[PDB]
Each structure stands twice: as structure tokens, then as C-alpha cells.
């Protein structure tokens, strides 16, 4: 195709059913009804017109740029929007239901691949999944249509609330004797001028009580009977709801007003809550009805594993398409291992070494494991390695589940297309990689053969396993201090064989301390039928644990389906929709570790995603952003299908987002590769020209922000849009806020669209920063951080929320003057804050600068973030300091680093312009903030380590193995006492600043 | 005879470093560290069994050592030597393996400024060949992207041709009988209009198979460059780890006397 845009008029070749073909000149913008009608008016000039019916009996088909033979049922669509590979149309008679096909097209646009590609999949697991997961779709659709229209509004506009109503006393103390004042607004005229009604109310009033005080204040002089007032209250309670001014957030549920996140922030920031009084019928009006039509594809002797008396045995036959220099290396061989998660169940075994030019072994490999001892989650990890001291390295890897999704043991010959080795991985095998076969062509194909035991073999039912447990089991103070001691240690603590079998010995006394379950499970001999059978019984009746603990059991160290099932049941019962929406990035990544498409976790996530459109929004984008990765493209694809097929009318909005982003990447691709030989000034005059296009304007205007769909993006401010002066040249974008009362929130919605570098390192750090900020607030430390919005929407492409009224400290240094010889004046920053915080607010700006500065020192040190400099350190006009561009973390490349060094510029702000900054009382108070913040993270180090370990399979090179996470165990000094940790933190800070600590 | 001189005692190296020194090694291989706690008296034994690295706590209680409450060893050296001959089944039948292979703490065989110079060039060799591989990796993925998109374009050509070929079969079906009538009616003009269009259909279809061929040829030659880029990457990957191994040992060999020379060298 290779055409950016069709000319205004083009020649399309139309293939008529009588055999003729007609070259029809037609407008680019022309719709198919226009094309089909004028075609059959042109067809009359060609032979064999008698054989043609009325155009009503035909539709067009063609081949898209995705190689899809698409039937253009939706004839309202525009020629230039069809994604045509070639400008031709084949007239045909329509067949099949029209709604399924027009819906599948818009689903394919959303998920990024034609849905028909799923129909042509051999794998039975793929066809069973998309069939069987439809039940989760219907039970979620039924659950939102029940109790309409309120239930539907709760799905599309769910309450944005904190996890608990109780205000931390730090926040309650800002209230005026436990009360907050709010201004409630009303649009009163057609011209849309507004009225104000200011109230003072208890912080824990529910929205309906706020409605009651508003109508009471308005009717104070009406002389209402006590009952006549209540009728007015009932009326306005049942007729109106409250909306946040400037954004699409509504208070539709009777939570205490102080736990709605918008208002708890107004209490935190001391701002003035602005709420619009809205007629709830006017809200239900903008919620069109949507339905879940069951798709078309929803239609249409064994023995036990525990009776095979033999050791495991697998045959390695040959390989193909192996790419290696026959003259540079010596030989190749196949390395194999039997794994249960990350732990090999038995010692590995290799084939014999063979010349590169003849990859052929035909070897039976014997493994030191008795088949009945195989755990259910057992899997074969293998690779093809080269050899040339003696040094090895892998050429291509591949993993296989010894049991399929039907509980059967693999048997017979099997071909396995291998995957490339991930960048920077020297390990010979890749057990944490996905089980599957590379769909790419000409990839090295390794052929194997599994034993056939005269019949299909199945894993024993749980009924038989508990029998064997009872059969195998038949064959105090200082101890309970050990159990409580080992429970305390972090997830990645060293547990010795002495501690393991001690835990396994007291496995029954462990139930009294349920959070010990991760340690105990790691002590089980998973390569023994006996121990596993007993552990299943403990898990069956294990006391539930809190979600932040169960999330550990979903990482790559716990593959057993009974452990994960227990973990998932902990989440669906204890994980609030708030903390689900906060950890969603990890819960989506641990889907990769799942052995099978159909599991309890994915069904859990999909359900909550289809019953809470807030988490369903990022549930879609985190999956869509990774659809380029072929290793997971199929799983995430089928999952996206199920979602987009039942999410409701929100699909129409998602497509406007996907289409808008698609034109930002197409445009930015042209500027970075087609028009690369030009500077900024000449690229700007080209940028605006493309943005002047109507089609571009119609697409990029009037849609929802992917960073937060509550923000509507109205018309563009072209004059404010630009291409930024950075190496990768991103786009600075500015929309108007079309809210009726945008003037009360923000009229400028500014986002940076960046295409070039990977953004999911920043999503994680920004997520991490938000976590540690939240626990600091809840522990009395008011260290305001700024986890701005960042979202990866594709392969090295995403969006970044820009902070209003902020500058880099470099930009600020340039506002001042020079002092030393060719040296900026250290006092420029302080003079800048003074200039913008004159008077009594000065003591506040320095307090906000000191507190935020303390939080970013601790956060950056713990995480080993890339070195800070004056162009990635920023400070608000407000005085708040924050960082940007969290490129690397955990010390990525080649000592205990300190990336954020307090130059003199910051100290002369903290010390309010003194000379002996390190000796002032103001600086000693800043140090007290850091120490408390650091120790506060140490006492929450478990959930931070679990968050990183759940991201190991993400593919981020900064962390590939559990060893990479050890950096955090070092900066937090988890193998030492709190006192040794405090002393350690001071040590590193002192060395970095050459004294003071 | 002292623990400080034993080949298998590595001091305060990291758990992450013994994992690297034991990967893919044989059963019985073992090391000994100062426990990660870094507290006086405590040590941790790590031996390989069944493809894993088992951790064993060396307890210390009143000048004697051992794995259990009967601490029957006056020194940590005699404890390791006893099990270098007897099997660990004596402690735990689940193990049943003796310490067969220690990981010696010196193996590889001029002024400090000379080795500091030799380090400066060995590192430059490593750092510049690391840029070699990083360049091939981006050309490897840049080529991978262009290939799988050319494959879908060919499949698109395959679908268009299939559509244009059934068009020729429908033209020949519904035109046969009408051409046979126009010929005995003596109507040569209408037969010429039917063949004029048919010849145009038969011409465009050939222009399409030509575009498909020209792409098929363009893809086959790029798919070969892909395999060659993979060859030379697999040739650089082993050399790159080799040059990295000499870099780190030269760095630690020099860290014993030249902490400030490395500070200025790199």
C-alpha cells in the first residue's frame, strides 16, 4: 500500500458478478453507498448488464492492509477509512448476520488484529477459551443491566473513592472541627450562566445529605412545614446527583464525602470543592443502551498418572533453520530441564554435541524423576546452545507444559518453533519465558517425542490425591518464635534447608500464622508425590491472607493451580476495586506466567473489568499496548476480544482513542523517518499543515483522555501544539476542556505524545512513587510527591501528563545570572521561589520544597534511579519539587549509587538562604524527614519487592531475574537491623555529599 | 589449615555471586560465605544438588560449629573436610552427597600501572564490542519488523489474486453462452466489448502477480540477511562474555591497590 493519504479523486476497480470490471473514478471521502450506487449506474455501459440485480442485493468485499478479506457490511463507511491494500472492490451477495460482522470489524480495529484470525486456529485450547469465557461476559453484563439505570451508571461512572472512610488524623486536622465547606453550582439559563450555593457540612456526609443541606439553604425563607421541607429534600435527592466541576466524575454512591478522592485531596491541598448539581435523568440520557449479543462461535478409556511405573523420558530428534557460523563455533547441543516455576525439579541433562551443519541427535533423555512424582505445573524448558576456557551461550529457547489444559500428559511427536534469546540474557535456559511455539516462519524448529503409555494419561482427580495424603501421613515456645520470625522476613529472604524442613515439619502448626504460606510452600519437595499431596490439603482449608500477600503467590515462583487458585480467591474477596486499579499493571503481567488461557485469575480480572469501566479502561490499554509482542499476542488478543465484545458502548469511545493515537504515531513516524533531514523550525511548519487537515482535526478532537477518561479532550489549541526540542522530538499537545464548568478545574489539558523510547519503566516508578507517597501520608509524613500520568499505549509509544506551571531547575538557573567564572548563581533558585512566594506564603513554599525534596531523595535512592541532573529535576511555581524521565532503575548498567545529589542550590532553599546550610536547624529538620521516610519504606518492603518480582516476565531489561531485585534489598538493607539500616542510609548520603550526614 | 586460607571460603561475597559461580555446575560443588547477615561467627554453606543451590547454616556456639544442636566441630575447616569425605546423608538422608568440588578463589594466570593499562584496553575492547552487538541487535529487530510486514503484504497479494482469479472464472462462465449467441447472430461488436473487458481483467491480474513476485523476491533476499545477522550475533555473544570476564578480574585484581587509578582511568 505504502500511501500516506489517497488523492482527492482516485480510480477504484470494481469487479462485478457478471465477470466485467469497471474503473470508477470516485472521491476519496466517498461512502460505499455512494460508490455502489454510482457503480451500478456506470455498469449499464458494460456488457452483460442483464445478469446484474439491483444494487440492494450486493455488498463490497476487498483485501485490507491486514490481509483480511473483509465484507464491507457497514456501507456508511468512508473509502479512505477502509484500510484497503489495493483500490479495488469485489461485488458479492451478503451472507451471514450483519451485526456480528460489522461488530467484528470494529473489534478488530480496537484490539489491533482481525478477529477472523482467531477462527483459523488449530489449537483446541484457543477455541475452548473464547467459547467458555463468554459466561464471564454474560454474568457481568447481566450484573450491570440488573437495577438499571443506576447499575449502568455505576459501571460507566464508578465512584472514585479511597479504600477506607476513616480519615488519617493528619488530614482530619485540616477540617474546621470536623467540617468542610463546599460550593454547589447550578446552570440557570439557556446562555448557561451559573449560580453558587456555599455550604459547610460534616466531612462524612453522603452526597444525598449534601443535597439535603443545599435545598435547606435555598428554602430557608420559604416558611416550609417540617414535612413540606422533607418532600423537597426527597424530590431533590431522587431527582439530582452531584458532579465534580470540570471533569466527568459523579458521586453516585453513598460513601462519606471525605473518601471520594477528589474531596479528600481538596482537604489535603486545602482547596475548595466545586460540585455541580445535575439532574440524574440528564446523566442517564447520555448512557445509551448496549447489549451483549452471543457470538456466532458460541455454538457447535484413560489411566492415571499415578500408575505409570517408570522414570520420565523424552526424545530429542532434530532441528532446522539453525543460524550459526559453521567456521566460528565448534558444535551445538540441546539443553533440557524439568522445572516447576523457577526451581528445577531434577538435574538437567543435555544431548550429545553435534556438528552445526547437521542438527540431529535422535536421543532419548532420561530424567531423575519418577513420573507419578510429577507436579501438575511441571514443564519442560529447553534451548539450543553453542560451544566454542570453554564458553556456552544459547541460540534459541522454548518451554512446554508437560500437562495440557485438559489435565492430560503429553504423548507422541511434537514440533516446537523456538524463540530468540532475550537481549542481555546469558543463562542457557529461560524458564520464566512463556510456554508456546513461535508463530514466525523460518524459525528454528526442534522436534521432540514423548512416551506413549498405551493410552491417554490424566492427572489424578483431587479425590484421589487426598486419599494418598491420608495414606502418606500415617507413614513449642522457641519454635513458635521461629515461625513468627521466618514469617517476618521478606519474600526473597534466604531460607536454609534447616529452616525449610523445619517449616515442613510444623506445616500443621503454621495454619495459626497464615501469612507464612509463601515460606512454607517454598519448602515443599515438589518433586515428590507425597509432600505435594499433603500440601494440597493444607491449602484447601488455609486461612485467607490479605491481597498484598496473595499477590506474591501469582508471581513466577508459584505455578501450582491450587496455590494460585487460593491466591485468586483471596483477591476476589479482599481486593478492593481501588487497590485492584492500583496494582492492575502487575496483575496483568502475571497472566503471562499462567500455564493455560483459561484460569481463575484471568476470569477474575475480566469480570471486574466488565463491571467497573474505570479499571476496564486500563485493562484494555495495558493489553493493547503489548499486542505487538508475539509471545503474548495470542493470549492478550483473545482476552481483548472477550472484553471488547461485552464492554458495552465504551468500545465506540475506545476506537476514537485508538484512531487518535494511530494518527499521532503515523504522523510522528513520518517526522522521524520520512522527514528526518530537517530541523525544528522547518518541522514545525510541516506539523501544523498536517494538523490543519479536517480528517486529522475530526479525529484528534472530541475524545476521552487515555491517561484518565474522566478528562474530555475538546478542540485542539493548534497555536499551543509544537514539536519539542529533544533528541527523539515528541509532540506537545494542548486541548480545550469542553466541560460546562471547566473554568473551575482547568481549561488547558496538556499531554506529551512520545514515540521512540520504552515508557513502562516510568509507569512502574511513577506507580511505585505513588505507593510510597500514600503510606507516608498515612504515617504522618506529608511528603507531597508528583506521580504524574504516564501510559504506554504501544511499542515504545505513549502519553505523558505535563505539569502546569513547572520548570526544570536548569530553566530556572538560566533565569538568574552568573556568579563564579562561567558558573550560574547558586542563589538563583531561592531568589526564584522568593519572587513567586512573596510575603507570608514564603515559609510555606520552603516547607513544600523541603518536604517534597526529602521524599524524592529517599525514593530515588531506594530505587537506584538514573542519575539526576538539572534538566530532569523540576520544581513548580508552587515550590513543589519533582523529577521526570525515570529512564533506568535498580542500577541497570556497569558500588551503591546515589542518583539525586543535593547541590548547593537546594540547600540554600532549605536553609532559607543561610551560609552554613548543613549546620542550620532547617537542614537538621530536613534530615529527620528523610530518615523517617526511609525507615517507613523498609517496614513496607515486602509489597515493593512483590511488585517488582511480578514484573520479571515483563521484558524490561532493567530486571530479568530475581537477582536484579536484590538491589532494593541492598538499599533497604533488609538483611540487617533497622538500626544498621539507618546507619547505612546515613553512610551513603554522607559519602555522596562529602559530609553532613 | 586456617579458614582464611581455605580455597572454598570467599568471605563476604553476595548470594547473587555464588548463584553465578554455581550455575550449570555439577552436584557436590560448594562454597562458603559469611552469612548475608554479616555478623561475626555465622557462616553459610552453599552446595549444588539436583540442579539447585542448597543453603546450609553453619551454627556457632562457644567456639564450635555444626549444622545442628550437636555442634561437634572445633573449626569450620574440619567441618567442611569431614563432609568432603563422608556423605551429607549423615546429616540429612535427603541430600546424600559429599563435597566433591571446591570453587577455588584464584585460577587465572609488571607494574600496577601496566595491569591498569592492560585493564584500560581490555575494557575498551569489551565496551566497543558491546556497541558492535547492540548495533546488530537493532538491525536484527529493524530487519525482523520489515520482514513480518512484508509477509502479511504477500498474504494480502494472495487474497487479491484469489479474488481476481475467481473473477476470471465467473467471466468465462457467464460470458460463454452469451458469446456463443452473439456469434451465430453475427454480432461481432458485442463479442468485442466482452473480450475488450476480459482482456483488461486478464491484464490487471498479471500486473498484480508481478507485484507479488517482485515482493516475494525482495523478501527472500532480506530474510537471508536476517539469518546472517543472526549468525554474526551468535559469533559475538560468546566473545563478548569472554572479554567481560577478563575485565572484572583485572578490575578486582587492581582494586586491591589502585582504587583511585580506576577512579581516573574510567
UniProtKB/Swiss-Prot annotation, chain A:
Region (G-loop): 723-729
Native organism: Homo sapiens
Segments forming domain PIK helical: 476-646
Domain PI3K/PI4K catalytic: 717-997
Subunit structure: Heterodimer of a catalytic subunit PIK3CA and a p85 regulatory subunit (PIK3R1, PIK3R2 or PIK3R3). Interacts with IRS1 in nuclear extracts. Interacts with RUFY3. Interacts with RASD2. Interacts with APPL1. Interacts with HRAS and KRAS. Interaction with HRAS/KRAS is required for PI3K pathway signaling and cell proliferation stimulated by EGF and FGF2. Interacts with FAM83B; activates the PI3K/AKT signaling cascade.
A Gene Ontology molecular function term of the record: protein serine/threonine kinase activity
More about this protein: The avian sarcoma virus 16 genome encodes an oncogene derived from PIK3CA.
Keyword Transferase: yes
Region (Activation loop): 883-903
Record gene name: PIK3CA
CDD domains: C2_PI3K_class_I_alpha (cd08398), PI3Ka_I (cd00872), PI3Kc_IA_alpha (cd05175)
Lineage, uppermost ranks: Eukaryota, Metazoa, Chordata, Craniata, Vertebrata
Protein name per its UniProtKB record: Phosphatidylinositol 4,5-bisphosphate 3-kinase catalytic subunit alpha isoform
Result of changing residue 993 to R: In CLOVE, KERSEB, CRC, BC, OC, MADAC, CCM4 and HFMH; also found in an endometrial carcinoma sample; somatic mutation; shows an increase in lipid kinase activity; oncogenic in vivo; requires binding to p85 regulatory subunit to induce cellular transformation but not interaction with RAS; may mimic the conformatitonal change triggered by the interaction with RAS; enhances invadopodia-mediated extracellular matrix degradation and invasion in breast cancer cells; may alter the interaction of the PI3K/PI4K kinase domain with the cell membrane; increased AKT and RPS6 phosphorylation in HFMH patient's cell
From Swiss-Prot, chain B:
Modified residues (Phosphotyrosine): 137, 250
Annotated tissue distribution: Isoform 2 is expressed in skeletal muscle and brain, and at lower levels in kidney and cardiac muscle. Isoform 2 and isoform 4 are present in skeletal muscle (at protein level).
Complex formation: Heterodimer of a regulatory subunit PIK3R1 and a p110 catalytic subunit (PIK3CA, PIK3CB or PIK3CD). Interacts (via SH2 domains) with CCDC88A/GIV (tyrosine-phosphorylated form); the interaction enables recruitment of PIK3R1 to the EGFR receptor, enhancing PI3K activity and cell migration. Interacts (via SH2 domain) with CSF1R (tyrosine phosphorylated). Interacts with PIK3R2; the interaction is dissociated in an insulin-dependent manner.
Full protein: residues contained: 326 to 596 of 724
Protein name as it appears in the record: Phosphatidylinositol 3-kinase regulatory subunit alpha
Family under the similarity heading: Belongs to the PI3K p85 subunit family.
Domain of life: Eukaryota
All residue ranges annotated as the SH2 domain in the record: 8-103
Post-translational modification summary for this protein: Polyubiquitinated in T-cells by CBLB; which does not promote proteasomal degradation but impairs association with CD28 and CD3Z upon T-cell activation.
Physiological role: Binds to activated (phosphorylated) protein-Tyr kinases, through its SH2 domain, and acts as an adapter, mediating the association of the p110 catalytic unit to the plasma membrane. Necessary for the insulin-stimulated increase in glucose uptake and glycogen synthesis in insulin-sensitive tissues. Plays an important role in signaling in response to FGFR1, FGFR2, FGFR3, FGFR4, KITLG/SCF, KIT, PDGFRA and PDGFRB. Likewise, plays a role in ITGB2 signaling.
Clinical disorder: Agammaglobulinemia 7, autosomal recessive: A primary immunodeficiency characterized by profoundly low or absent serum antibodies and low or absent circulating B-cells due to an early block of B-cell development. Affected individuals develop severe infections in the first years of life. SHORT syndrome: A rare, multisystem disease characterized by short stature, anomalies of the anterior chamber of the eye, characteristic facial features such as triangular facies, lack of facial fat, and hypoplastic nasal alae with overhanging columella, partial lipodystrophy, hernias, hyperextensibility, and delayed dentition. The clinical phenotype can include insulin resistance, nephrocalcinosis, and hearing deficits. Developmental milestones and cognition are normal.
Species: Homo sapiens
Domain notes: The SH3 domain mediates the binding to CBLB, and to HIV-1 Nef.
Outcome (variant: residue 159 to K): In SHORTS; there is 70 to 90% reduction in the effect of insulin on AKT1 activation, glycogen synthesis and glucose uptake, indicating severe insulin resistance for both proximal and distal PI3K-dependent signaling
Amino acid at each position: 500500500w505504502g500511501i500516506h493519504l489517497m488523492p482527492p479523486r482516485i480510480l477504484v476497480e470494481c469487479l462485478l458478478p457478471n465477470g466485467m470490471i469497471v474503473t470508477l473514478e470516485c472521491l476519496r471521502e466517498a461512502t460505499l453507498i455512494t460508490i455502489k450506487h454510482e457503480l451500478f449506474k456506470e455498469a449499464r455501459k458494460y456488457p452483460l448488464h442483464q445478469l446484474l440485480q439491483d444494487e440492494s442485493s450486493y455488498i463490497f468485499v476487498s483485501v485490507t492492509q491486514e490481509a483480511e478479506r473483509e465484507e464491507f457490511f457497514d456501507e456508511t463507511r468512508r473509502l479512505c477509512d477502509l484500510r484497503l491494500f489495493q483500490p479495488f472492490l469485489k461485488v458479492i451477495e451478503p451472507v451471514g448476520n450483519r451485526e456480528e460482522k460489522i461488530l467484528n470489524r470494529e473489534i478488530g480495529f480496537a484490539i489491533g488484529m482481525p478477529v477472523c484470525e482467531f477462527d483459523m486456529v488449530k489449537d483446541p485450547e484457543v477455541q475452548d477459551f473464547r467459547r467458555n469465557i463468554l459466561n464471564v461476559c454474560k454474568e457481568a453484563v447481566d450484573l450491570r443491566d440488573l437495577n438499571s439505570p443506576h447499575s449502568r451508571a455505576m459501571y460507566v461512572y464508578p465512584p472514585n473513592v479511597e479504600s477506607s472512610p476513616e480519615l488519617p488524623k493528619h488530614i482530619y486536622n485540616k477540617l474546621d472541627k470536623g467540617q468542610i465547606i463546599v460550593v454547589i453550582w447550578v446552570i440557570v439559563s439557556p446562555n448557561n450562566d451559573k449560580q453558587k450555593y456555599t455550604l459547610k457540612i460534616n466531612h462524612d456526609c453522603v452526597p444525598e445529605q449534601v443535597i439535603a443541606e443545599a435545598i435547606r439553604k435555598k428554602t430557608r425563607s420559604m416558611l416550609l412545614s417540617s414535612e413540606q421541607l422533607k418532600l423537597c429534600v426527597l424530590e431533590y435527592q431522587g431527582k439530582y446527583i452531584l458532579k465534580v466541576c470540570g471533569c466527568d466524575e459523579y458521586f453516585l454512591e453513598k460513601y462519606p464525602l471525605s473518601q471520594y478522592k477528589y474531596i479528600r485531596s481538596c482537604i489535603m491541598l486545602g482547596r475548595m470543592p466545586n460540585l455541580m448539581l445535575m439532574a440524574k435523568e440528564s446523566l442517564y440520557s447520555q448512557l445509551p443502551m448496549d447489549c451483549f449479543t452471543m457470538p456466532s462461535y458460541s455454538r457447535r478409556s484413560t489411566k492415571s498418572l499415578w500408575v505409570i511405573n517408570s522414570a520420565l523420558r523424552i526424545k530429542i530428534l532434530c532441528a532446522t533453520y539453525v543460524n550459526v557460523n559453521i567456521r566460528d563455533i565448534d558444535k551445538i547441543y540441546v539443553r533440557t530441564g524439568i522445572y516447576h516455576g523457577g526451581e528445577p525439579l531434577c538435574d538437567n541433562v543435555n544431548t550429545q554435541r553435534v556438528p552445526c551443519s547437521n542438527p540431529r541427535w535422535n536421543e532419548w533423555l532420561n530424567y531423575d524423576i519418577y513420573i507419578p512424582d510429577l507436579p501438575r505445573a511441571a514443564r519442560l524448558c529447553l534451548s539450543i546452545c553453542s560451544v566454542k576456557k570453554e564458553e556456552h551461550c544459547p541460540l534459541a529457547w522454548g518451554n512446554i507444559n508437560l500437562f495440557d489444559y485438559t489435565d492430560t500428559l503429553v504423548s507422541g511427536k511434537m514440533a516446537l518453533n523456538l524463540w530468540p534469546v532475550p537481549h542481555g540474557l546469558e543463562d542457557l535456559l529461560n524458564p520464566i519465558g512463556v510456554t508456546g511455539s513461535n508463530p514466525n516462519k523460518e524459525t528454528p524448529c526442534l522436534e521432540l517425542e514423548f512416551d506413549w503409555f498405551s493410552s491417554v494419561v490424566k492427572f489424578p482427580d483431587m479425590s484421589v490425591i487426598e486419599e494418598h495424603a491420608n495414606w502418606s501421613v500415617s507413614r513449642r515456645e522457641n519454635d513458635k518464635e521461629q515461625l513468627k520470625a521466618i514469617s517476618t522476613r521478606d519474600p526473597l529472604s534466604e531460607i536454609t534447608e534447616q529452616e525449610k524442613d523445619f517449616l515442613w515439619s510444623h506445616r500443621h502448626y503454621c495454619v495459626t500464622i497464615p501469612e507464612i504460606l509463601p515460606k512454607l510452600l517454598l519448602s515443599v519437595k515438589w518433586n515428590s508425590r507425597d509432600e505435594v499431596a499433603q500440601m494440597y490439603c493444607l491449602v484447601k482449608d488455609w486461612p485467607p491472607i490479605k491481597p498484598e500477600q496473595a499477590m506474591e503467590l501469582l508471581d513466577c515462583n508459584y505455578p501450582d493451580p491450587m496455590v494460585r487458585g487460593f491466591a485468586v480467591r483471596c483477591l476476589e474477596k479482599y481486593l478492593t476495586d481501588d487497590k485492584l486499579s492500583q496494582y492492575l499493571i502487575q496483575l496483568v503481567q502475571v497472566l503471562k506466567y499462567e500455564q493455560y488461557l483459561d484460569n481463575l485469575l484471568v476470569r477474575f480480572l475480566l469480570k471486574k473489568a466488565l463491571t467497573n469501566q474505570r479499571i476496564g479502561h486500563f485493562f484494555f490499554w495495558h493489553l493493547k499496548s503489548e499486542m505487538h509482542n508475539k509471545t503474548v499476542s495470542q493470549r492478550f488478543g483473545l482476552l481483548l476480544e472477550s472484553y471488547c465484545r461485552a464492554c458495552g458502548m465504551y468500545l465506540k469511545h475506545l476506537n476514537r482513542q485508538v484512531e487518535a493515537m494511530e494518527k499521532l504515531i503515523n504522523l510522528t513516524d513520518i517526522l522521524k523517518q520520512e522527514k528526518k533531514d530537517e530541523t525544528q523550525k522547518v518541522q514545525m511548519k510541516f506539523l501544523v499543515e498536517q494538523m490543519r487537515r479536517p480528517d486529522f482535526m475530526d479525529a484528534l478532537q472530541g475524545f476521552l483522555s487515555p491517561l484518565n477518561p474522566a478528562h474530555q479532550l475538546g478542540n485542539l489549541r493548534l497555536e499551543e501544539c509544537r514539536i519539542m526540542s529533544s533528541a527523539k522530538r515528541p509532540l506537545w499537545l494542548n486541548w480545550e476542556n469542553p466541560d460546562i464548568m471547566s473554568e473551575l478545574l482547568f481549561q488547558n489539558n496538556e499531554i506529551i505524545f512520545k514515540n521512540g523510547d520504552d515508557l513502562r519503566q516510568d509507569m512502574l516508578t511513577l506507580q511505585i512513587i505513588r505507593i510510597m507517597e500514600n503510606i507516608w501520608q498515612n504515617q504522618g509524613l506529608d511528603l507531597r510527591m508528583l506521580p504524574y500520568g504516564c501510559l504506554s499505549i504501544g511499542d515504545c509509544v505513549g502519553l505523558i501528563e505535563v505539569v502546569r506551571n513547572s520548570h526544570t531547575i536548569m530553566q530556572i538557573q538560566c533565569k538568574g545570572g552568573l556568579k563564579g567564572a562561567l558558573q550560574f548563581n547558586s542563589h538563583t533558585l531561592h531568589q526564584w521561589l522568593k519572587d513567586k512566594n512573596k510575603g507570608e506564603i514564603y515559609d510555606a513554599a520552603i516547607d513544600l520544597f523541603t518536604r517534597s525534596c526529602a521524599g524524592y531523595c529517599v525514593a530515588t535512592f531506594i530505587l537506584g534511579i538514573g542519575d539526576r541532573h538539572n534538566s530532569n529535576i523540576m520544581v513548580k511555581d508552587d515550590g513543589q519539587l519533582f523529577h521526570i524521565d525515570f529512564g533506568h532503575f535498580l542500577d541497570h548498567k556497569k558500588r551503591e549509587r546515589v542518583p539525586f545529589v543535593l547541590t548547593q542550590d537546594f540547600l540554600i532553599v532549605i536553609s532559607k538562604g543561610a551560609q552554613e546550610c548543613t549546620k542550620t536547624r532547617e537542614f537538621e529538620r530536613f534530615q529527620e524527614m528523610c530518615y523517617k521516610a526511609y525507615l517507613a519504606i523498609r517496614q513496607h518492603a515486602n509489597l515493593f519487592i512483590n511488585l517488582f518480582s511480578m514484573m520479571l516476565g515483563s521484558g524490561m531489561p532493567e530486571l530479568q531475574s530475581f537477582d536484579d531485585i536484590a538491589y532494593i534489598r541492598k538499599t533497604l538493607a533488609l538483611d540487617k537491623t533497622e538500626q544498621e539500616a539507618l546507619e547505612y542510609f546515613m553512610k551513603q548520603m554522607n559519602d555522596a555529599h562529602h559530609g553532613g550526614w | 589449615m586456617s579458614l582464611q586460607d581455605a580455597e572454598w571460603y570467599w568471605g563476604d561475597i553476595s548470594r547473587e555471586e555464588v548463584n553465578e559461580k554455581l550455575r550449570d555446575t555439577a552436584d557436590g560443588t560448594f562454597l562458603v560465605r559469611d552469612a548475608s547477615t554479616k555478623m561475626h561467627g555465622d557462616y553459610t554453606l552453599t552446595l549444588r544438588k539436583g540442579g539447585n543451590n542448597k543453603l546450609i547454616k553453619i551454627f556457632h556456639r562457644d567456639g564450635k560449629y555444626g549444622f545442628s544442636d550437636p555442634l561437634t566441630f572445633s573449626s569450620v575447616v574440619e567441618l567442611i573436610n569431614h563432609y568432603r569425605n563422608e556423605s551429607l546423608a549423615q546429616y540429612n538422608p535427603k541430600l546424600d552427597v559429599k563435597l566433591l568440588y571446591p570453587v577455588s578463589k584464584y585460577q587465572q594466570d609488571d607494574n600496577i600501572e601496566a595491569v591498569g593499562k592492560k585493564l584500560h584496553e581490555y575494557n575498551t575492547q569489551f565496551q566497543e564490542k558491546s556497541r558492535e552487538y547492540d548495533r546488530l541487535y537493532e538491525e536484527y529487530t529493524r530487519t525482523s519488523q520489515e520482514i513480518q510486514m512484508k509477509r502479511t503484504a504477500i498474504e494480502a497479494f494472495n487474497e487479491t489474486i484469489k479474488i481476481f482469479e475467481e473473477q476470471c472464472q465467473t467471466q468465462e462462465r457467464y460470458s460463454k453462452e452469451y458469446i456463443e449467441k452473439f456469434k451465430r447472430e453475427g454480432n461481432e461488436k458485442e463479442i468485442q466489448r466482452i473480450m475488450h473487458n476480459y482482456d483488461k481483467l486478464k491484464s490487471r491480474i498479471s500486473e498484480i502477480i508481478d507485484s507479488r513476485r517482485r515482493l516475494e523476491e525482495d523478501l527472500k533476499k532480506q530474510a537471508a540477511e536476517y539469518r546472517e545477522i543472526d549468525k554474526r550475533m551468535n559469533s559475538i555473544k560468546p566473545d563478548l562474555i569472554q572479554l567481560r570476564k577478563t575485565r572484572d578480574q583485572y578490575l578486582m585484581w587492581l582494586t586491591q591497590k589502585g582504587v583511585r587509578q580506576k577512579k581516573l582511568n574510567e
